[PDB]
Write a protein that binds this ligand. Structure first.
Ligand SMILES: *[C@@H]1O[C@H](CO)[C@@H](O)[C@H](O)[C@H]1NC(C)=O
Ligand SMILES: *[C@@H]1O[C@H](CO)[C@@H](O)[C@H](O)[C@H]1NC(C)=O
Length: 298
């Protein structure tokens, strides 16, 4: 479904250029910032997909664009890419983020993009690294945002639960989540050697992180009746791909476990996270995943 902005010309200092930085003031008055990349094939009459990519704690929109490579037209030819900036270089959900409504920021950003661009409102996506992956999950866990965003790709996400380290049991801790629709697509990447946001979860900064299998299981549990899974060994079995599904919706929840990888956006080439490279590039996999899943009618 093409948005109201269809037919409108691009903002006049923006068509396939370097990303552009924009100040944007929310209804209630906080001035926020994002960088936006317009695909070189953008047409003002063609409903266009949109990807939000949320940076890690202490990082920036600009650094996240370099890391996540969603402005790379070889990997993402079709979608607008938006890199929002977190206040204090962090996002809602972090133990340090207080009374910052980043969900409202995201929702008002989306409303803006629908107004000014030809957005396909059935193909709006969210991805993020770490704090930004946690925030991606919060979007999926929000009754409203989960009905407006088609699919979600947290990378090494930090799914902080408000439970003390002493009481933290990472394989069973409740994960606070209220999706507004069934069949939410989730793609999660995580390194087994992550020391920052551990694969096995546990106490962190006064709060509690779930184990990543626990996270994955809790999402898949929602697919409910007909639930099945497969495992595949990839890259000579250094990577495991787990897919959950039901009545022929195979992989609606997918997890890549990357053996030996740290707290890193997966890339074959060096990136700002990881100087060595790993077995695979997450971003093409994420783009393909987004393409698999649209927001269903109603
Ligand atoms: C955004 O706002 C700040 C002041 O709040 C200003 O310093 C900055 O240059 C502005 N940037 C753009 C792209 O408008
Ligand atoms: C990169 O490779 C070196 C060995 O050359 C290793 O010591 C280091 O832990 C690696 N770093 C990461 C982030 O994987």
């Amino acid at each position: 479904a093409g948005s109201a902005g269809c037919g409108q010309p691009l903002p006049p200092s923006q068509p396939g250029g370097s990303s552009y930085g924009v100040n944007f003031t929310l209804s209630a008055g906080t001035q926020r910032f994002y960088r936006i990349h317009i695909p070189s094939n953008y047409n003002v009459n063609t409903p266009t997909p949109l990807i939000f990519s949320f940076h890690g704690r202490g990082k920036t929109a600009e650094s996240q664009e370099k890391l996540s490579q969603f402005s790379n037209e070889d990997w993402n030819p079709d979608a607008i890419a938006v890199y929002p900036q977190g206040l204090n270089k962090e996002w809602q959900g972090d133990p340090h983020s207080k009374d910052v409504d980043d969900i409202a920021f995201t929702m008002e950003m989306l409303d803006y993009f629908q107004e000014k661009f030809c957005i396909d409102s059935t193909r709006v996506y969210a991805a993020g690294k770490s704090n930004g992956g946690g925030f991606t999950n919060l979007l999926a866990c929000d009754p409203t945002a989960s009905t407006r965003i088609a699919a979600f790709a947290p990378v090494s996400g930090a799914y902080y639960q408000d439970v003390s380290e002493e009481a933290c049991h990472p394989t069973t801790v409740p994960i606070k989540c209220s999706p507004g629709r069934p069949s939410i697509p989730i793609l999660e990447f995580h390194g087994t050697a992550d020391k920052t946001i551990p694969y096995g979860g546990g106490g962190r900064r006064g709060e509690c992180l779930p184990s990543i299998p626990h996270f994955v299981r809790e999402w898949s549990k929602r697919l409910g009746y007909g639930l099945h899974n497969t495992t595949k060994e990839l890259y000579d079995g250094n990577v495991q791909e787990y897919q959950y599904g039901n009545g022929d919706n195979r992989g609606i929840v997918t997890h890549y476990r990357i053996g030996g990888l740290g707290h890193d956006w997966p890339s074959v080439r060096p990136n700002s996270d990881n100087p060595n490279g790993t077995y695979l590039d997450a971003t093409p996999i994420i783009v393909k995943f987004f393409k698999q899943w649209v927001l269903p009618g109603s």
